[PDB]
Design a protein around this motif. Structure first.
Motif, PDB file in Angstrom:
ATOM      1  N   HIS A  60      36.648  19.611   9.015  1.00 54.09           N
ATOM      2  CA  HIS A  60      37.397  19.384   7.782  1.00 54.09           C
ATOM      3  C   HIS A  60      38.904  19.212   8.033  1.00 54.09           C
ATOM      4  O   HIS A  60      39.551  18.367   7.415  1.00 54.09           O
ATOM      5  CB  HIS A  60      37.156  20.531   6.806  1.00 54.09           C
ATOM      6  CG  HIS A  60      37.645  20.254   5.418  1.00 54.09           C
ATOM      7  ND1 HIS A  60      38.690  20.946   4.844  1.00 54.09           N
ATOM      8  CD2 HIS A  60      37.231  19.358   4.489  1.00 54.09           C
ATOM      9  CE1 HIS A  60      38.898  20.492   3.621  1.00 54.09           C
ATOM     10  NE2 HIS A  60      38.026  19.528   3.381  1.00 54.09           N
ATOM     11  N   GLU A 104      33.377  21.293  15.424  1.00 50.25           N
ATOM     12  CA  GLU A 104      32.564  21.973  14.428  1.00 50.25           C
ATOM     13  C   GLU A 104      32.742  23.476  14.511  1.00 50.25           C
ATOM     14  O   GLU A 104      32.661  24.166  13.482  1.00 50.25           O
ATOM     15  CB  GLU A 104      31.101  21.582  14.595  1.00 50.25           C
ATOM     16  CG  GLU A 104      30.951  20.079  14.484  1.00 50.25           C
ATOM     17  CD  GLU A 104      29.646  19.657  13.902  1.00 50.25           C
ATOM     18  OE1 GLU A 104      29.654  18.941  12.877  1.00 50.25           O
ATOM     19  OE2 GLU A 104      28.610  20.051  14.473  1.00 50.25           O
ATOM     20  N   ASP A 108      36.547  23.945  13.009  1.00 49.79           N
ATOM     21  CA  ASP A 108      36.690  23.580  11.607  1.00 49.79           C
ATOM     22  C   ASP A 108      35.997  24.587  10.711  1.00 49.79           C
ATOM     23  O   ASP A 108      36.430  24.800   9.576  1.00 49.79           O
ATOM     24  CB  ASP A 108      36.121  22.183  11.350  1.00 49.79           C
ATOM     25  CG  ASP A 108      37.032  21.072  11.846  1.00 49.79           C
ATOM     26  OD1 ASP A 108      38.204  21.350  12.191  1.00 49.79           O
ATOM     27  OD2 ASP A 108      36.566  19.911  11.881  1.00 49.79           O
ATOM     28  N   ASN A 109      34.924  25.208  11.202  1.00 50.28           N
ATOM     29  CA  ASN A 109      34.106  26.108  10.403  1.00 50.28           C
ATOM     30  C   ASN A 109      34.336  27.568  10.740  1.00 50.28           C
ATOM     31  O   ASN A 109      33.709  28.435  10.122  1.00 50.28           O
ATOM     32  CB  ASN A 109      32.618  25.766  10.573  1.00 50.28           C
ATOM     33  CG  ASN A 109      32.284  24.395  10.031  1.00 50.28           C
ATOM     34  OD1 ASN A 109      32.323  24.175   8.823  1.00 50.28           O
ATOM     35  ND2 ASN A 109      31.994  23.455  10.922  1.00 50.28           N
TER      36      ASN A 109
END
Ligand SMILES: [Mg+2]
Ligand SMILES: [Mg+2]
Ligand SMILES: [Mg+2]
Ligand SMILES: [Mg+2]
Lengths: 339, 339, 339, 339
Positions: B1, B305, B308-309
């Motif tokens: 994101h 990933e 971002d998470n």
């Protein structure tokens, strides 16, 4: 405040090695005279320290580099036999305060197994403590590692007796010392070189299948695991997602996390950091962490005032402080063991 | 994101070294064909990855062992000159997505300084990336460290240009490889030997006064600092309370914590662990931690990933993700730099 | 050991309220005589404590429940004006050691706004400190909250003057006390009731869009944030994945993490826990955490020995200790502000 | 990936209350039709979810506010008996997948005790789950708390039968809702009001000596403990260093850390945060943490993908995932209980 704590990375030296003791102290002590007194004393100063700081039981072991410094195998074996008989006499003064680890020459797998067996059967020793690789070869510049099949008879003796093996560090010597350390000598010892040696040796045991052939073998590392918890994610990733697809799985059947759950223990010796302790509780689990001091290179006061006053839940303070070591060393009833 | 992330431990290889690339891949890849394509590609696959995973800008560097594998100094210097000219051409295709670190032969302090200066002045390179010690001597079995006074002219060139130096790992070779690693070869690389080399080299710089003589020098370590954060308490203790009373203070005037506040950076390359990240935020500070991938030995997907998470506060996600690197590399305006 | 620290949750009481001061001390002090002297003293005992413990600057504020306990709005406003006039004179004695927050009656938004403005413009006060809701109604059994449109003129005054607002707790009273707390009265105050009040009020401001209409407003919470960082994941989940799809988005435009990155601050007042501080560093970020004490309900010694000796990286110790507050309050030089 | 997991904060509703179920879902679900089907389903959808996500055993309990919403004690008792009879029949369909907690009317200690006893002795229920205080008085505006001597006969029944009591939250109502929550209604439930209720009730039991008079009583809190671990340091400080010197010791004989070591449990229900779980491991200990979901207000997928993929040591994953609950509830074999 906590009583009946157990410490088990606690060193002594023979009185007849005063010159060697003082040279070593010139590296790792800021008070050589107290160091000499403390590292040779068993039953007076050491007990006063333990009585002041709530340490009920200690498992004593021989200072580094110890027998691993001796590349003549006949002298090395004779030195270990002498140390073991000496410490067994000394600890009879306070059997409810002191146990001992076997000191071993590690030139020969069967020779070491026999002396460990003698120590456990004759003296009730609690396991073995070895300072990384055994110095060997004409000038001591060769190193004997134990992560291979020749040492199966030794590891099987550890599991038969059901005693743990403590992989302690020692200083770099010869070619390795000259090549990597002489130009940055202040990194020798606790700052860096100690962990590099022990972690190499224990991960060697991991990847060479020692804990596959000997699933009940218990191995102990000091200093919160010699960097290994820091890389638990990195090692596991580069095992399960990389090397285990390129051939590592031939000699290493479990994950690095499995081995920390089933085989490997860490202690708090020389690493009195609650922040690191908490991180280790996440990466290895409070169940696998043991209190220890590293005396007399560390003081009881640093270690015990840290641990006693660390913010920590009551369950894990008890487990780390004594109850884990109590179950692992089959310890019943020592001073303040249930206080 | 998160968009506009910066990664800076990202490797390429010259197309003419395909055989060397494939041997290396046999050690560290489970998909040799994709690895070969990805490590040679600059402007197509690498950009597709970056576009998918919100990476706005990357600072590219040469694969390990790279020029540090070359013990012939004339060939080593020629190889570095070639790499630098090659990568400078390739990154002109996407100047708002790519910068580069200088690739250097490190046989000679002045030679390296000149080529770093050429790279920065002529090409706008962002600093230097070097794979630990330079191989030297008749058969490559000697190692050149940079933690001494001979290298003052080089470090002063880094501070004059005000560019950082990234101390990347490389594999063990020759005597060291034979003595310590051959019998436990699966530990070579990310599992263990990489950190042992970089941490030795950087702590060498610490204890040999490099950051005292060059207080503005910025040094970067990958992989969350190659074990060093784990021992921040232990190193600081054994410096300030031990070795600094035995002579270390002659060549090392600040604490190890000072050097992490003022000189040393760590990146998240190859260590996509929120638990370790949090521990590093405590021991070194979110301000000193940079996102990075370690592509193509790691994938964009694992790294981005994860990041971002990851559960992380908004302030530090921005700082680690781009804003720290933005200030350090004087980066204005690249793709999505403020998105 | 850190010098120039800034604390900003430090209380005083007017000499003429000795009776209220002793009644409050019978709840929250184990040494009432010392508490009476310490809470009324400004320029002697308070300075000595601060000199002993490295605290260069303190922003003083009125004890709880303070003006928020007064439900006669005319009496409330007059006490507020009285207190601000008094403390402005007291802090002239040592202006390089002390600032003040405004004390306010919060019965009327425009009245509160004008008295905050006077404090800032006439006296150079650094913001406001208010003890949760304003007691109101005929017997003080009503509560005035400030998370609604009637208070826009007040919040706009905070942002026009660019000074923060510190949401301090106060005891439950009236119906709320009788229904929830009277039967478990040892929970009143720091153990639980305080955080319940502040967290409700501040999260009210979030979910009623105060920070949407006033995106520059800065709000400060004591005690490491009154439980909110603990539930950061849970709150964010039940906002973004739940209530934001049912109507909350209408009056709440950003995530809880945004508001902690942009509007909300926390202090270490009365919460001297490195483990919890590290966790808050992960969940809110070191940039948003301010050292503070909660004197005289807490001692300088407890707060400062904790913080000065806590294992912490050097960058964040400097920020939490003083530099975060130096910037938020635009502070000039003060004693040891750069020591 | 972990099989045989145990969850124990899993709700159901009676088919005949569809209207109440949809009204509650308009508060707490973004998919009311699915929520209606999921909360009433026992033996089909619930099983499929559990089969997909490695959940071998579930202890079911009645949705909030449940019987605690009923202030007619005759109506309340009859609904309690109705619910227990219903769920006992439902769980016979798949006894190796399901257990149940007793649902109780808490208007009268002896009445609650007898119905808990019937549930345990007639149906083999594993404990009780109660939604905070029992609504009482003519319009339900009073609250019955259980932290007092009138409830000794009930707590003695829990300890005689040796089964835990799960303090679940419920919405604020009546005067409390109107005074505190109506003007900030998006905070009701998981965002804040739930934890405020449970933490007050459980800490009431602590400070009114329930665990002193019933030292074997086990109490369970959802949602990683309803803020309490965050303030463990602060609560313990304001107890041992403050209130315990002013009167609290009269009705509270141990520290808050003792009660979490000996009496209190927390679950991961609705709080799928590894960062917060690690912090709870430090403050309460992995031995005292139980996996749980909070279905159908939370999904199996959210809860189980978090826990199965969370970076965690293997020992604690097994304990939190199932082994802590297997021992506390003395569970026989169930699906994958040793997988
Ligand atoms: Mg030692
Ligand atoms: Mg790399
Ligand atoms: Mg206060
Ligand atoms: Mg629930």
């Amino acid at each position: 405040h906590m009583l009946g704590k157990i410490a088990l990375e606690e060193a002594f030296a023979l009185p007849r090695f005063e010159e060697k003791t003082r040279w070593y102290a010139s590296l790792f002590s800021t008070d050589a005279e107290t160091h000499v007194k403390e590292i040779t004393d068993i039953n007076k100063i050491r007990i006063e320290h333990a009585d002041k700081h709530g340490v009920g039981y200690q498992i004593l072991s021989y200072t580094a580099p110890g027998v691993q410094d001796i590349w003549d195998p006949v002298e090395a074996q004779a030195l270990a036999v002498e140390i073991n008989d000496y410490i067994a006499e000394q600890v009879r003064v306070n059997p409810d305060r002191f146990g001992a680890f076997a000191t071993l020459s590690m030139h020969n797998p069967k020779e070491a197994a026999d002396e460990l067996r003698r120590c456990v059967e004759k003296y009730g020793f609690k396991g073995a403590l070895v300072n990384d690789t055994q110095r060997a070869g004409p000038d001591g510049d060769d190193m004997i590692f134990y992560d291979n099949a020749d040492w199966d008879i030794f590891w099987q003796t550890c599991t038969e007796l059901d005693v743990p093996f403590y992989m302690h560090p020692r200083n770099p010597t010869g070619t390795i010392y000259e090549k990597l350390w002489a130009d940055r000598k202040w990194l020798v010892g606790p700052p860096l070189s100690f962990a590099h040696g022990v972690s190499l040796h224990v991960l060697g045991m991991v990847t060479n299948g020692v804990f596959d052939r000997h699933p009940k073998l218990q191995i102990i590392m000091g200093h919160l695991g010699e960097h290994v918890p820091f890389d638990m994610w990195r090692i596991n990733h580069w095992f399960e997602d990389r090397k285990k697809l390129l051939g590592l799985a031939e000699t290493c059947k479990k994950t690095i996390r499995d081995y920390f759950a089933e085989n490997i223990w860490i202690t708090t010796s020389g690493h009195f950091s609650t922040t690191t302790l908490n991180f280790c509780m996440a990466e290895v689990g409070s169940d696998r962490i043991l209190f220890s001091i590293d005396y007399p290179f560390e003081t009881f006061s640093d270690a015990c005032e840290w641990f006693d006053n660390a913010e920590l839940n009551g369950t894990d303070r008890l487990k780390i402080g004594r109850e884990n070591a109590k179950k692992l060393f089959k310890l019943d009833s020592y001073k303040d063991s249930s206080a």
